Write a protein that binds this ligand. Structure first.
Ligand code: CDL
Ligand code: PC1
Ligand code: PC1
Ligand code: PTY
Ligand code: HEM
Ligand code: HEM
Ligand code: LMT
Ligand code: LMT
Lengths: 273, 55, 402, 124, 63, 438, 124
C-alpha cells in the first residue's frame, strides 16, 4: 500500500510539472491553457479569487506568472525524483510483486545481470520510438497554436490540455457545477488511494480472474474514451456520453470492483471444492 | 515494536534525527553541522523565490 | 470429606465457612502410568486448551471475570487440575472440567506452540534447584520404570500428538477420574457432576506396565548450576514408621537463623549445606531419601558421611524424647499436608481412586524408640543403596564410599 | 476479505437448493477458465500470504504439505517465466485441488476474531 | 564509595517543592512561551515571505 | 461468609485478634508489631534486622539449644520477618501446641539474653548476607527503588543497614530500640485457625501483661515523604536478563484512593511467559508483550505505607534490543488509564479483584498475616462486605481522575539492572508519561 | 604510526645517554601540560581504538583491566560534558599511569607484521 500511495503523489507531481513546463513556451495554448486551468482555483469557496490572483502574481496570466512557473518547473522534477526514490525504498521491504501474484521468496534472481539486461531491451525499443518522433515527426504530438505567440486578446478556436490530461478534463466537463467539476477531477486521481480497500479479493492480481480481467479491459477502454471526449467540442451527443463514461469511471472503484472481487472469492472456493 | 522503528521510511528518519546514538560530551563546535543545514535551507527557500522574479 | 458417587464418578466434598471454593479433578494418570516418557506432564499442560465448546482464549477471559485461578501439576501417581473460585461460581467450574475431559481438541499447533514450550520452561525452573534433580535421578535408579519414569517431559524424548491423544483416551474416563471439592456443599457438587460427567466414557483402570522392581546403583549428573546429593533407599514394604523416621532425622530448621536439633541438621554444622530426609510411600513400593544440597562439593561430601552415620546411630537406639519429637513432627507434617489444597486433593484422590483410606493427622501413630530404631536399622542394612550426585560429580561421594 | 467470510457465504449458498443449482455450475466453469490448474497450482496456493494471520497458518502446515507447496510455487514460477503451461502429471486434476490450507487459516482467524470480540466485552 | 544503596549527594540540585503543580507549571510556562514566540515568529516569517508572490508594486501601478 | 474476627484489648493496650476455623487441625499464633527499619535512624540502621537474628539466639532462661529443642518438641515451626514498617514473629503449631508456642514468643520478645558473644557471632552472619543479597535480583531492584524514590529519607534505607552500622551495633542500642518500639499499644497478638479467642486472651494476660505502654499512645497505623523522580542504573552486560522497575508515588493504607489505585493496578496486571494462561489475558499490555516477545514477565504493584506508597511495574526481559519497546508500550498503557479507560476495563478489573482479595487468604498463616497486617495498618479487620462495597464504589471516572493526578506527566523512579544499554535516558522514559496526541 | 614504531624509536632514545638526558625531561613536561591526567585518564586510554589490531588487543585485556578502562572512559566523558576537572583520587597520579595496553598491542602488531613479511618470502 505504501509504495502505491507514494506513487499516486508522484503522478500528481508529474501532472503539475508538465502543466507548468507547457506554459513556459508562452504561445497561444500556453497562455490560454494557463488561464483556464488556473481559473479552476477560483471555485474554492470564499478565498478562491484571492488565491488565483496570488498564484498569477497579478490580475491575469502574465510575466509574473511565467517567471514563477519557470522556477517551479525547474524545482518540481527534483521533488519528483525524491518521491520516486521514496516509493522504491518503501517497496524494498516486500520486494517486487510478480505476474502470478504469489510469493517470490521461494525463487529469487539478482537484479544484475538478469533485469539489467532485460531493461536494456526496452531502453532501445524506447529510443527507437523516441527517434521516430524526435527526428522524423517532431511536432506530431503538439498543437500548432503553440507556435503563435501568446495574445490575451485573441482566443484560440479550442483550448484543450495536452493529450495526457484529456481524461481528467472530460471528467471535469461531465459535472455541470464549477466546484463539482473540480472536485470530481481531483477525486478521479485521489480515488486510486482506495483500491487497497475496495478490492476484496483473497488473491493478488488478475492473472487467474476471468471476470476481473474483463472488467479491467472495460475500465481501460473507458479511460481512453474519456481521453478522446476531452478534446471533442462540447456538443451533442458527446455531452451525455462524457457523463456516462464519467459514471463508469467512478463506479469501477466504488461498485464494480468490490462486487466482482467478492463474487470471484466465492467462485474460487466453491469451484474448487 | 514502535512504528518509528517498524516502518522503513520512518526508521530512516528515526535513525538520523531521533534515536541516532550520539556521544554525550559534544561541545558547541558540534553545532556547525546543523547551522550549515539551516544556511542550506535558507538559500533554497530564498534562492527559489528570487528565481521567481529574476531574469 | 464425604465420599460419594455421581454418575459413576467418585466425588468427595467438604463444606466450609469461607467465600472461596477449590475444585480439583484428580486423574489416575501420573507418570508411573505413562506410556511414553513425559506424556503425563504433556497431558497436564494440555488441560484447558481448546475444547469444542470453549476455546482456551475464551476460558481464560471468562475465568478472569470470575476472578478464578487455575493450578495444575503432575506427580508419579496423579495429574491434579485445580480451580479456585468464589463459592457461587461452582456450576461454571464443573462444566469447564467436563469440557476438558470430554471435548479437548488435541491440535498439533497447540502442542508445538503452547503446550510443549510451557512444559519445557516448567522443567527448567524445577531443575534450577539441584536437589530436585538429585531426587528425580534417585527415583530413576531405584525403580527404573514405573516410579522410575521421569515425571516431566524432556527434550531427548519427544512426545507426539498421537502419544498424548492415546494416553488421554485412557485417562480421561470415568474409571480414572475423581472430583474433590474443598468448601463445596457436597449435595450440590454431586448433582452437578452427575449431569456434567454423565456422557464421559467409562473406559478402564490405567495400569502400570510391568511390576515395580527395585534396583540399586549410581547416577552422576554433571551440571554447572550447583551441587546436590541424594542418598536414597528403595523399600519393598512401605511402612508408616518411615514417616516418623524422616520427621525425626529431619534436616531443616524449625526457627530462623538456626541449624536445628535434628540429627541431619546437626550434620551440616560448620558448612553451608542443607539436608532433607524424605519418605515417598508409593503403594507397592517406597523410597527413603536423604537429599543434601550445597555450594561446595567437599562440604556435601562431609555432611554425606555424617548423614549415613546419623542413620546408623538412629538404628542403634533412640531415646523416648527423640521418639516423642518424631511423633509430634510427623503429626504436624500430616496436618499441613491435609491442609494445603495441592496435597489435600491428592490425598483424597488416592482414597477415591486407589482405595487407601486417609490417615487423619489425629490418628498418626506414636512409634516407640524401639520401632524407630528398628526402622533405621533396616535402612542402614539395605542391599540396594542409591546415590545420585548432581553438579561437580567428580568431587561428590560414591555409593561405595558411603 | 477474510477467508472466514468467504467460507461462510459459500456455505449459505450451498445450503440453498436453488442457489447451489445456479452457482455451483458457474463456479466450476469459472475455475476452468481461471486456468491456475494449468500451472500446476492448487487454489489455496493463490491465497495472499503476506499477513500475520496467513504467515501463522503457513507455519502450522504439516512439513510434507509445506514442502509440496514450496515445490508447486517454484514449478509455477518456472512455467510463468518460460511462458509454458503444465502438461501431463503437472496439470492439477480436479480431485487433487484440495483445500489443504483452509482449515489452518480458519482456526487462526477464529482465534483472532474471538480475541477482538472479547477485547470489547462489557460486564453486565 | 562502595555501597550502591547510598545515593550520591544531590542536595546542591534538588528542589524542595519538586512534586507540586506550581513547580511543573513554571517549566511549562517556559516551554509554552517558547512555543508561543516560535508560532508568532513563524507566522510573521511565512506571511512576510510569501507576500513576495502577491502582485508587486509595478504590477499594481498598472491596474 | 468467613467467621467474624474477634478483637479484645488488655489493660496495657495490647490488642488480641483472632479468626477461628474448625476444619483445620493446625493453628498460626504470632505477634504483629507496628515497628520496623523506618523507626531506626542512620546510626542504628539495621538494628531491627539484627534483633530478629538475636531473638532466636537464647533467652534469659532457655539457651539457644534449649530453645531449638522446645520448638522441635512442639512439632511446629517458628518464623519471623522484619520490613520497613512492620515486624512479625509467628509460630505455626498443632491445635494443642498453641499455649506452649505463645509462651515461647513472649519470652523471646520480652526477655531475650542479647549476649555479647552471640552478637559477635551474628555480626559475621549478617555481613555475609550483605554480600549475598546481590543474587536476589528482584530484592536488589526494589531496595534501590526505595533508596532513590525516598532519597535520604527513612523509607529509603535498607533493612539490613550499612556495613559500618553492622560493625558498631551494641547490646545497648538493641535494648533501646526494642524498649522504645515494642510497646503494647503497638503490638497485636493474632490467632488464626484452631484457636479459641477466649483462650488466647487468657494466654495474653498470662504472658504479655507486663509489657510497657508508650508515653504517647497514638492509634495503630499512625505515620513527610517527599518523592524524588530519579534513576539508578546498575548495568551488567554479563547478566542475560534485564530487571527494570518503574514507579510513581502511590497511596497510603488509609488513602481515599486506596481501592482506586488497586483497580488501576489490576487493569495493567501481571504477565509471565511460563504460565500457560498468560498469553490469553485480557490486559492490553499483556497482549502487546506476549505477541511481540518483549519480556519474560511483568508484575504491577501498588505498595502502601502509613503516609505514602509506590505504584508501578517490575519487568524482566531477555530481549535486550527491544527494551525501548517494552518500556514504551508499558508507559503507553499507563497513559490510557488517564485518557481511554472506560466502564469495560474498570468493571473487568473490579470483577477480578472481588475474588482476588478473598482468594489471597488461603491457609492459616495467610489468614493470620491478613488479620495482623490490617490491625497494624488500619487499626481494624475490614469485613469482606465493607471491602466489596469500597470496590463497588470505584468508577471509571475515579480511575481516570486518579491517573490524571498520579500518573499523567509525573516524575518516575526508575531502576534498571543487567544488560540495560537499550534502556533510554531518564528524559525519554519520562516523556512517555504523557501523550502529545491528547 | 604503529605502536611498534613509537615504542622502538623511544627505546633508541632511552639507550642514548645524551638523548635521554634531553628528551626525558621534555617528555615529562609535555605530559604534565597535556593534562589528560586531570580527567583521570591513563595515557593508553587515549590510543585510537577503531582499528582491527586495536580491537583485537582490547579483547585480550584481562576482564578487570577492561572493566576499569570502561569506567575511566565514562568518568572522563562525564567530566568533559560538565566542563569539570578531576579532583582528589580521580586525578591520575604518575605512578598510576601504567602502560596496561602496550604489551597486548605490541603482540598483535608483531604477529601482523610477521604475517606481512612472510607473505613476501622468496625461497632461495
Ligand atoms: C556564526 C553563527 C553564530 C553561532 C555561534 C556558534 C559558536 C559556538 C561555538 O562553537 O563556540 C562557543 C564556545 C563555547 O563552547 P563550549 O562547548 O562551552 O566549549 C567548547 C570548548 O571546547 C571548550 O574550551 P575550554 O573548556 O578549554 O574553554 C576555553 C574557552 C572558554 O570557553 C568558555 O565558554 C569559557 O576560552 C578560550 O579559549 C578563550 C581564549 C582566551 C583569549 C584571551 O566558545 C569557546 O569555547 C571558544 C573557544 C575558541 C578559541
Ligand atoms: C485494452 C484492454 C486490455 C485488457 C487486458 C486483459 C488481459 C490480456 O489479454 O492481456 C495480456 C496479458 C495477460 O498476462 P497474464 O499475466 O494475465 O497471463 C500470462 C499467462 N498465463 C495466464 C498463462 C499465466 O496481460 C498483461 O500482460 C496486462 C498488463 C496491463 C497493462 C495495461 C495498460 C493500459 C494503460 C491505462 C492506465 C489507466
Ligand atoms: C513553529 C511552530 C510552533 C507551534 C506552537 C504550538 C504549540 C506547540 C508547542 O509549543 O509545543 C507544545 C507541545 C508539547 O510540549 P511538551 O511535550 O513539553 O508538553 C507535553 C506535556 N504536557 C502536555 C503535559 C504539557 O509540543 C508539541 O506537541 C510538538 C509541537 C512543536 C512546536
Ligand atoms: C522557530 C522554529 C524553532 C522552534 C520549534 C521548537 C519547538 C517549540 C516548543 C515545543 C517543545 O519544546 O516541545 C518539544 C518539541 O520539540 C521537538 O520535538 C523539537 C526539538 C528541537 C526543535 C528542532 C531541533 C533542531 C535540531 C537540528 C537543527 C537543524 C537546523 C537545520 C534547519 C517536545 O519535547 P520533548 O520532545 O523533549 O518531550 C517532552 C514530552 N513530550
Ligand atoms: C553543506 C555543508 C555541510 C553540512 C550541512 C554538514 C553537516 C554535518 C553534520 C550535521 C554533521 C554531524 C554534526 C556535526 O559534527 O556538526 C557533520 C559532521 C561532519 N562533517 Fe559535515 N557538513 C557539511 C560540510 C562539510 C565539509 C565541507 C566537511 C569537510 C571538509 C565536512 C566533514 C564532516 C565530518 C568529518 C564530520 C564528522 C565530524 C565529527 O563528528 O567528528 N562536512 N556534518
Ligand atoms: C548553497 C546555496 C546557495 C548559495 C551559496 C548561493 C549564493 C549566491 C550568491 C553569493 C548570490 C549573489 C547574491 C547577491 O549579491 O545579490 C546569489 C544570487 C542568486 N541566487 Fe543563489 N545561492 C544558493 C542557492 C540558490 C538557489 C537554490 C537558487 C534557486 C534558484 C538561487 C538563486 C539565486 C538567484 C536567482 C540569484 C540572483 C539574484 C540575486 O543576486 O539575489 N540560489 N546566490
Ligand atoms: C532529506 C534527506 C532525504 C531522505 C533520507 C533519509 C535519511 C537518510 C537515510 C538513508 C540511510 C539508510 O541507510 C541505513 O538505514 C537504516 C534504516 O534506518 C539505518 O540503520 C540504523 O538504524 C537501525 C534502527 O534505527 C539499526 O538497526 C541499525 O543498526 C543502524 O545501522 C542506517 O541509517 C543505515 O544503515
Ligand atoms: C504554508 C502557508 C499556507 C497559507 C498561509 C497564507 C500566507 C500568505 C498570505 C500573505 C499575506 C500578506 O498579508 C499582508 O502582509 C503584509 C506583510 O507581509 C502586511 O503589511 C504590513 O506589515 C508590513 C511589514 O510586515 C508593512 O510593510 C506594511 O506597511 C503593513 O501593512 C499586510 O497588512 C498584510 O495584508
Amino acid at each position: 500500500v505504501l509504495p502505491w500511495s507514494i506513487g499516486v503523489i508522484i503522478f500528481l507531481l508529474l501532472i503539475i510539472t508538465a502543466f507548468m513546463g507547457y506554459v513556459l513556451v508562452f504561445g497561444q495554448m500556453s497562455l490560454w491553457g494557463a488561464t483556464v486551468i488556473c481559473n479552476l482555483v477560483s471555485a474554492i469557496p470564499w478565498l478562491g479569487e484571492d488565491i488565483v490572483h496570488f498564484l498569477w502574481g497579478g490580475f491575469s496570466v502574465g510575466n509574473p506568472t511565467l517567471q514563477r512557473f519557470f522556477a517551479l518547473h525547474y524545482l518540481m522534477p527534483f521533488v519528483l525524483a525524491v518521491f520516486a526514490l521514496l516509493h522504491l525504498i518503501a517497496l524494498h521491504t516486500a520486494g517486487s510483486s510478480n505476474p502470478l501474484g504469489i510469493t517470490s521468496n521461494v525463487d529469487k534472481l539478482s537484479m544484475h545481470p538478469y533485469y539489467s539486461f532485460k531493461d536494456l531491451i526496452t531502453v532501445f525499443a524506447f529510443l527507437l520510438m523516441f527517434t521516430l518522433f524526435v527526428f522524423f515527426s517532431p511536432d506530431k504530438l503538439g498543437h500548432p497554436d503553440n507556435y503563435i505567440p501568446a495574445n490575451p486578446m485573441v482566443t484560440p478556436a479550442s483550448i484543450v490540455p495536452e493529450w495526457y490530461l484529456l481524461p481528467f478534463y472530460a471528467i471535469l466537463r461531465a459535472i455541470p457545477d464549477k466546484l463539482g467539476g473540480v472536485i470530481a477531477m481531483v477525486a478521479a486521481i485521489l480515488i486510486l488511494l482506495i483500491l487497497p480497500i475496495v478490492d476484496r479479493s483473497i488473491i493478488r492480481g488478475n492473472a487467474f480472474k476471468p471476470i476481473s480481467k474483463l472488467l479491467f479491459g472495460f475500465f481501460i477502454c473507458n479511460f481512453l474514451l474519456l481521453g478522446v471526449l476531452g478534446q471533442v467540442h462540447i456538443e451533442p451527443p458527446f455531452i451525455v456520453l462524457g457523463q456516462i463514461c464519467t459514471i463508469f469511471y467512478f463506479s469501477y472503484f466504488l461498485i464494480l470492483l468490490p462486487m466482482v472481487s467478492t463474487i470471484e472469492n466465492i467462485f474460487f472456493y466453491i469451484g474448487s471444492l | 515494536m514502535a512504528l518509528r522503528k517498524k516502518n522503513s521510511l520512518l526508521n530512516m528518519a528515526n535513525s538520523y534525527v531521533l534515536d541516532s546514538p550520539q556521544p554525550s560530551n559534544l561541545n558547541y563546535f558540534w553545532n556547525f553541522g546543523s547551522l550549515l543545514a539551516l544556511c542550506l535551507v535558507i538559500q533554497l527557500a530564498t534562492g527559489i523565490t528570487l528565481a521567481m522574479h529574476y531574469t | 470429606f464425604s465420599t460419594a458417587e455421581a454418575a459413576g464418578v467418585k466425588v468427595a466434598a467438604q463444606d466450609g465457612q469461607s467465600p472461596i471454593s477449590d475444585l480439583s479433578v484428580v486423574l489416575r494418570g501420573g507418570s508411573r502410568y505413562a506410556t511414553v516418557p513425559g506424556v503425563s506432564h504433556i497431558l497436564e499442560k494440555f488441560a484447558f486448551q481448546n475444547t469444542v465448546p470453549k476455546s482456551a482464549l475464551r476460558f481464560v477471559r471468562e475465568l478472569e471475570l470470575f476472578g478464578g485461578k487455575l493450578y495444575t501439576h503432575t506427580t508419579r501417581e496423579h495429574i491434579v487440575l485445580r480451580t479456585q473460585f468464589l463459592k457461587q461460581d461452582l456450576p461454571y467450574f464443573v462444566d469447564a472440567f467436563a469440557n476438558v475431559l470430554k471435548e479437548t481438541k488435541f491440535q498439533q499447533f497447540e502442542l508445538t506452540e503452547r503446550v510443549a514450550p510451557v512444559a519445557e520452561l516448567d522443567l527448567l525452573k524445577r531443575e534450577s534447584d539441584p536437589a530436585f534433580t538429585a531426587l528425580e535421578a534417585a527415583h530413576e535408579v531405584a525403580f527404573r520404570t514405573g516410579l522410575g519414569n521421569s515425571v516431566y517431559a524432556q527434550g531427548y524424548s519427544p512426545v507426539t500428538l498421537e502419544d498424548v491423544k492415546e494416553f488421554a483416551r485412557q485417562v480421561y474416563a470415568k474409571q480414572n477420574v475423581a472430583v474433590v471439592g474443598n468448601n463445596v456443599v457436597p449435595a450440590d457438587l454431586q448433582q452437578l457432576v452427575g449431569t456434567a460427567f454423565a456422557d464421559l466414557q467409562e473406559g478402564s483402570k490405567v495400569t502400570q506396565a510391568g511390576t515395580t522392581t527395585l534396583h540399586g546403583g549410581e547416577a552422576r549428573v554433571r551440571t554447572s548450576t550447583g551441587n546436590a546429593l541424594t542418598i536414597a533407599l528403595p523399600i519393598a514394604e512401605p511402612k508408616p514408621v518411615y514417616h516418623a523416621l524422616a520427621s525425626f532425622l529431619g534436616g531443616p530448621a524449625s526457627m530462623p537463623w538456626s541449624v536445628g536439633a535434628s540429627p541431619l541438621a546437626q550434620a551440616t554444622v560448620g558448612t553451608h549445606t542443607s539436608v532433607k530426609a524424605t519418605y515417598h510411600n508409593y503403594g507397592d513400593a517406597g523410597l527413603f531419601a536423604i537429599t543434601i544440597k550445597g555450594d561446595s562439593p567437599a562440604e556435601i561430601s562431609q555432611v554425606a558421611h555424617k548423614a549415613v552415620q546419623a542413620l546408623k546411630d538412629t538404628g542403634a537406639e533412640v531415646t523416648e524424647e527423640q521418639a516423642a519429637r518424631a511423633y509430634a513432627k510427623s503429626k504436624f507434617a500430616a496436618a499441613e499436608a491435609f491442609e494445603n489444597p495441592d496435597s489435600s486433593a491428592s490425598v483424597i484422590g488416592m482414597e477415591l481412586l486407589s482405595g487407601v483410606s486417609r490417615i487423619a493427622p489425629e490418628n498418626v501413630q506414636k512409634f516407640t524408640p524401639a520401632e524407630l530404631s528398628e526402622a533405621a536399622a533396616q535402612l542402614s542394612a539395605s542391599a540396594k543403596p542409591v546415590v545420585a550426585a548432581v553438579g561437580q560429580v567428580h568431587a561428590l561421594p560414591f555409593a561405595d564410599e558411603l | 476479505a477474510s477467508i472466514t467470510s468467504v467460507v461462510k457465504t459459500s456455505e449459505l449458498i450451498l445450503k440453498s437448493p436453488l442457489l447451489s443449482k445456479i452457482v455451483v455450475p458457474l463456479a466450476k466453469t469459472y475455475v476452468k477458465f481461471s486456468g491456475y490448474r494449468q500451472l500446476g497450482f492448487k487454489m489455496n496456493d493463490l491465497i495472499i500470504e503476506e499477513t500475520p494471520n496467513m504467515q501463522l497458518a503457513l507455519r502450522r502446515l504439516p512439513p510434507t504439505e509445506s514442502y509440496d507447496r514450496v515445490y508447486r510455487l517454484i514449478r509455477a514460477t518456472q512455467f510463468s517465466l518460460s511462458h509454458k503451461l503444465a502438461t501431463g502429471n503437472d496439470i492439477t486434476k480436479p480431485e487433487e485441488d484440495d483445500h489443504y490450507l483452509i482449515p489452518y487459516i480458519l482456526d487462526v482467524e477464529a482465534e483472532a476474531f474471538e480475541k477482538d470480540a472479547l477485547d470489547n466485552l462489557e460486564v453486565v | 564509595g562502595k555501597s550502591t544503596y547510598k545515593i550520591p549527594d544531590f542536595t546542591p540540585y534538588l528542589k524542595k517543592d519538586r512534586n507540586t503543580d506550581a513547580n511543573r507549571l513554571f517549566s511549562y510556562f517556559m516551554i509554552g512561551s517558547f512555543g508561543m514566540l516560535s508560532a508568532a515568529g513563524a507566522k510573521a516569517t511565512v506571511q512576510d515571505f510569501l507576500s513576495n508572490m502577491s502582485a508587486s508594486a509595478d504590477v499594481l501601478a498598472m491596474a | 461468609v468467613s467467621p467474624k474476627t474477634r478483637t479484645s484489648n488488655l489493660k496495657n493496650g495490647l490488642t488480641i485478634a483472632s479468626e477461628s476455623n474448625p476444619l483445620v487441625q493446625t493453628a498460626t499464633v504470632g505477634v504483629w508489631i507496628d515497628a520496623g527499619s523506618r523507626n531506626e535512624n542512620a546510626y542504628n540502621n539495621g538494628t531491627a534486622h539484627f534483633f530478629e537474628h538475636l531473638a532466636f539466639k537464647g533467652t534469659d532462661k532457655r539457651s539457644q539449644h534449649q530453645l531449638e529443642l522446645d520448638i522441635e518438641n512442639m512439632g511446629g515451626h517458628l518464623n519471623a520477618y522484619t520490613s520497613r514498617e512492620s515486624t512479625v514473629y509467628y509460630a505455626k503449631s498443632f491445635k494443642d501446641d498453641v499455649p506452649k508456642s505463645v509462651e515461647i514468643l513472649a519470652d523471646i520478645l520480652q526477655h531475650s539474653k542479647l549476649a555479647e558473644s552471640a552478637i559477635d557471632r551474628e555480626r559475621e552472619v549478617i555481613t555475609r548476607e550483605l554480600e549475598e543479597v546481590n543474587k536476589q535480583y528482584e530484592e536488589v531492584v526494589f531496595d534501590h527503588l526505595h533508596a532513590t524514590a525516598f532519597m535520604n529519607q527513612p523509607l529509603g534505607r535498607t533493612i539490613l543497614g550499612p556495613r559500618e552500622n553492622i560493625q558498631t551495633i551494641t547490646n545497648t542500642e538493641l535494648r533501646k530500640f526494642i524498649t522504645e518500639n515494642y510497646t503494647a499499644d503497638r503490638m497485636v497478638l493474632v490467632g488464626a485457625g484452631a484457636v479459641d479467642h477466649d483462650a488466647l486472651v487468657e494466654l495474653a494476660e498470662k504472658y504479655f501483661s507486663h509489657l510497657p505502654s508508650s508515653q504517647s499512645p497514638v492509634p495503630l497505623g499512625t505515620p513527610i515523604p517527599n518523592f524524588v523522580g530519579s534513576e539508578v542504573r546498575l548495568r551488567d552486560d554479563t547478566m542475560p536478563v534485564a530487571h527494570i522497575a518503574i514507579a510513581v508515588e502511590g497511596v497510603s493504607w488509609t488513602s481515599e484512593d486506596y481501592y482506586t489505585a488497586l483497580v488501576a493496578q489490576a487493569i495493567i496486571g501481571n504477565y509471565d511467559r511460563a504460565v500457560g494462561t498468560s498469553r490469553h489475558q485480557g490486559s492490553r499490555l499483556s497482549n502487546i508483550v506476549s505477541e511481540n516477545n518483549l519480556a519474560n514477565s511483568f508484575q504491577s504493584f501498588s505498595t502502601s505505607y502509613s503516609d505514602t506508597g509506590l505504584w508501578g511495574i517490575y519487568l524482566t526481559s531477555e530481549n535486550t534490543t527491544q527494551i525501548d519497546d517494552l518500556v514504551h508500550f508499558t508507559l503507553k498503557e499507563w497513559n490510557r488509564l488517564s485518557t481511554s479507560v472506560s466502564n469495560l476495563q474498570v468493571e473487568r478489573a473490579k470483577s477480578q479483584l472481588k475474588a482476588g482479595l478473598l482468594l489471597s487468604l488461603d491457609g492459616t498463616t495467610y489468614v493470620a498475616e491478613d488479620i495482623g497486617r490490617q490491625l497494624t495498618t488500619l487499626g481494624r479487620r475490614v469485613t469482606p462486605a465493607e471491602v466489596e462495597a469500597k470496590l463497588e464504589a470505584v468508577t471509571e471516572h475515579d480511575v481516570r481522575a486518579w491517573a490524571q493526578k498520579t500518573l499523567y506527566d509525573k516524575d518516575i523512579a526508575l531502576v534498571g539492572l543487567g544488560p540495560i544499554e537499550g534502556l533510554y535516558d531518564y528524559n525519554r522514559i519520562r516523556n512517555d508519561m504523557s501523550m502529545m496526541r491528547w
